[PDB]
Amino acid sequence: ASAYQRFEPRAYLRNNYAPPRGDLCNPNGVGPWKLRCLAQTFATGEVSGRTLIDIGSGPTVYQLLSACSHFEDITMTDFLEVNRQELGRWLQEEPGAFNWSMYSQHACLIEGKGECWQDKERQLRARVKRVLPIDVHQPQPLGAGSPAPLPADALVSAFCLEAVSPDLASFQRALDHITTLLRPGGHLLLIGALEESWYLAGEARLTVVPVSEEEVREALVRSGYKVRDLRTYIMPAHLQTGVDDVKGVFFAWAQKV
Amino acid sequence: PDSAPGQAAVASAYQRFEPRAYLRNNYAPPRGDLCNPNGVGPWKLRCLAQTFATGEVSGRTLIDIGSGPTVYQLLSACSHFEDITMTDFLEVNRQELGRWLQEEPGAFNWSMYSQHACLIEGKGECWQDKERQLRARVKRVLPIDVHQPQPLGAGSPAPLPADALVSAFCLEAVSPDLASFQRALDHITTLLRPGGHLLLIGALEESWYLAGEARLTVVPVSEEEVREALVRSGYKVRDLRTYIMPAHLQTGVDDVKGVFFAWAQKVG
Ligand SMILES: Nc1ncnc2c1ncn2[C@@H]1O[C@H](CSCC[C@H](N)C(=O)O)[C@@H](O)[C@H]1O
Numbered sequence: 425a426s427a428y429q430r431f432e433p434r435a436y437l438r439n440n441y442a443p444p445r446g447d448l449c450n451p452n453g454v455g456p457w458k459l460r461c462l463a464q465t466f467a468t469g470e471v472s473g474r475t476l477i478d479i480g481s482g483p484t485v486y487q488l489l490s491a492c493s494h495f496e497d498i499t500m501t502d503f504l505e506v507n508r509q510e511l512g513r514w515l516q517e518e519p520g521a522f523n524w525s526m527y528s529q530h531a532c533l534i535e536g537k538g539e540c541w542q543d544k545e546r547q548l549r550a551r552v553k554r555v556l557p558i559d560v561h562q563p564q565p566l567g568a569g570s571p572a573p574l575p576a577d578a579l580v581s582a583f584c585l586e587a588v589s590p591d592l593a594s595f596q597r598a599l600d601h602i603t604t605l606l607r608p609g610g611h612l613l614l615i616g617a618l619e620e621s622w623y624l625a626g627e628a629r630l631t632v633v634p635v636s637e638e639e640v641r642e643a644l645v646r647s648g649y650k651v652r653d654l655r656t657y658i659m660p661a662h663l664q665t666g667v668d669d670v671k672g673v674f675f676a677w678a679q680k681v
Numbered sequence: 682p683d684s685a686p687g688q689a690a691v692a693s694a695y696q697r698f699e700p701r702a703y704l705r706n707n708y709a710p711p712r713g714d715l716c717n718p719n720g721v722g723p724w725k726l727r728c729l730a731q732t733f734a735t736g737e738v739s740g741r742t743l744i745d746i747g748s749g750p751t752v753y754q755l756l757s758a759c760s761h762f763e764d765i766t767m768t769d770f771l772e773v774n775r776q777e778l779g780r781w782l783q784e785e786p787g788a789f790n791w792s793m794y795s796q797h798a799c800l801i802e803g804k805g806e807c808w809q810d811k812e813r814q815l816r817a818r819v820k821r822v823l824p825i826d827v828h829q830p831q832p833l834g835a836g837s838p839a840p841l842p843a844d845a846l847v848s849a850f851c852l853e854a855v856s857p858d859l860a861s862f863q864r865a866l867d868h869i870t871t872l873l874r875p876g877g878h879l880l881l882i883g884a885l886e887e888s889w890y891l892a893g894e895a896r897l898t899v900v901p902v903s904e905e906e907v908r909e910a911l912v913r914s915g916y917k918v919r920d921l922r923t924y925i926m927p928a929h930l931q932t933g934v935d936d937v938k939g940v941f942f943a944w945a946q947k948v949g
């Protein structure tokens with residue numbers, strides 16, 4: 425995990441959220457696919473509550489665009505200070521914030537409620553109460569006296585576990601860990617890379633545990649979830665860019681029983 | 682009597698028209714704020730979107746009558762017409778359109794409207810694609826004077842007669858009186874083929890507006906006057922709706938009391 429110390433947010437954002445992976449115009453892309461999964465899931469209106477925690481936010485907010493309308497208290501987290509600062513910069517509309525507006529626009533497009541994207545960002549920025557540091561390896565990943573309401577009504581995590589875990593069993597424990605933050609009967613929306621083993625974030629070179637839909641399902645089960653949905657996106661050639669070796673992307677809607 | 686003088690007056694007044702001012706007054710907030718569904722902007726795009734969505738307004742060629750320096754009136758229309766003709770009386774307006782066509786950064790930013798059309802049309806489309814199509818189908822920007830019996834001049838370029846017409850806030854804005862208005866309608870109707878469709882937007886009961894230094898003279902009209910005029914010109918009125926201008930939104934840029942949207946089909 426010392427590799428994460430060379431991790432550059434601006435390089436990561438650039439690699440994954442700027443064209444081509446960042447062009448949202450093509451519906452068959454990975455960005456539109458991620459957003460649709462979240463939109464659809466929340467649109468069921470079975471995922472709901474007062475509080476929600478985003479595990480391993482990094483420098484990104486997209487994972488919460490659809491979510492923000494169903495939970496009034498939203499908590500974001502990451503391991504690195506540089507990311508929290510990068511989040512802050514966008515939350516407070518500071519100088520040099522990253523432009524998520526294409527993503528805001530698309531979420532509004534997908535949820536199809538005629539909402540304008542400034543209302544969407546406005547609601548998100550507002551509903552996010554705190555940005556916290558976090559380590560999923562710790563059995564209490566948020567420490568002892570966290571400003572975060574526990575247990576949360578729901579959890580969201582994208583591209584975290586498989587990226588901070590050396591192997592399957594490690595990945596499994598990380599899940600066990602964060603699962604403890606989730607109220608019984610609550611919800612988890614997990615996104616991650618499939619059969620990925622490395623990706624770059626500037627000068628840093630992160631090791632990833634290559635997982636599969638089957639491994640991922642089984643791990644959610646082991647952690648005590650009822651899997652409600654598990655969808656797979658296969659990474660198209662034109663989005664294989666030399667920033668990683670991701671083969672596909674998985675999305676899971678799991679419920680703590 | 683005599684039309685010439687009033688028209689001359691109108692023409693004279695427009696020589697002070699400031700596009701950037703018009704744009705600031707009408708298509709930047711609070712009117713340009715597309716976030717409130719109850720605002721005039723959304724209402725307009727929604728009238729256009731819903732109408733094209735019926736699929737009853739189609740063809741090869743569209744002509745926008747008195748485009749000014751705005752494109753929003755064509756956002757939902759472009760996905761339905763191969764060939765679009767934009768027009769205006771003033772060159773400074775046409776230059777303004779030209780700047781946006783050329784995607785120069787100097788140009789006005791219509792992306793909020795682009796996005797909103799995409800939003801309400803419900804096809805998942807992205808605004809850059811919406812805009813790229815619009816820029817692609819606008820085949821020309823022509824001089825136009827609605828008071829002339831041939832508003833485009835004889836032997837004009839435009840493919841005539843067109844399958845459809847769009848016009849927004851033009852006729853009433855350049856007509857001194859109701860008869861002038863009615864005549865202007867008759868004139869542009871000659872550009873429209875029988876069985877074709879006219880989509881008309883304009884201000885209700887308005888007498889003036891601002892375009893910078895230029896404070897302009899509008900013939901105030903009513904829904905009925907508009908309905909009657911269309912019928913007079915040989916249309917069947919398919920839809921005619923009214924937006925009442927809210928307290929805020931009345932900003933001193935005009936004395937408009939509301940807005941009309943007319944969908945009319947040229948009997949033939
Ligand atoms: N031990 C740890 N516990 C929790 N998060 C960690 C961690 N070590 C690294 N991370 C964070 O995990 C993130 C994975 S990148 C994921 C970014 C974002 N969620 C997205 O969807 O794009 C990195 O930002 C990294 O800072």
Ligand SMILES: Nc1ncnc2c1ncn2[C@@H]1O[C@H](CSCC[C@H](N)C(=O)O)[C@@H](O)[C@H]1O
Pocket residue numbers: 695698746747748749750751754769770771774825826827828848849850851854855
């Ligand atoms: N005689 C005439 N014939 C046609 N257009 C005229 C005209 N005299 C003035 N105009 C144009 O009528 C326009 C009215 S403002 C309308 C602008 C635009 N259609 C919109 O929706 O906002 C001005 O751009 C002006 O140049």
